[PDB]
């Protein structure tokens, strides 16, 4: 839904790296290079951001007040 605060396996803070990851991928990096530029060295950290499906932007199209 929303980016997890910590990695599940080790407790590395990964929640502050989602917008940086999207800005690196829009700047035409490879996903492996974009995960290197964030310092995600263990693949436990690296699947937390690689495989994240961000359902909150789809879930906020139904935003109620529309005002």
């Amino acid at each position: 839904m929303i980016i997890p605060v910590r990695c599940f396996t080790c407790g590395k803070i990964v929640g502050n790296k989602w917008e940086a990851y999207l800005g690196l991928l829009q700047a035409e990096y490879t996903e492996g290079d974009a995960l290197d530029a964030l310092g995600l060295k263990r693949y436990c950290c690296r699947r937390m951001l690689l495989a994240h499906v961000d359902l909150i932007e789809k879930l906020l199209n139904y935003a109620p007040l529309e005002k």
Binding site: G32, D36, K41, R42, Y43
Partner: protein, 51 residues
């Protein structure tokens, strides 16, 4: 117009359309096989051991 009974017929002609086979009988045109998975180029060791 007496409409007498005539004799028995000799045979039978039968007209029907024939299909065209200049197209078929050609070498077959199958769907091309999808490639087997090939390793991507530019794979490097990204993880270096700590310390």
């Amino acid at each position: 117009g007496g409409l007498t009974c005539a004799s028995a017929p000799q045979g039978t002609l039968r007209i029907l359309e024939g299909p065209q086979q200049s197209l078929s009988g050609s070498p077959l045109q199958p769907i091309p096989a999808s490639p087997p998975p090939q390793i991507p180029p530019g794979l490097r060791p990204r993880f270096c051991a700590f310390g």
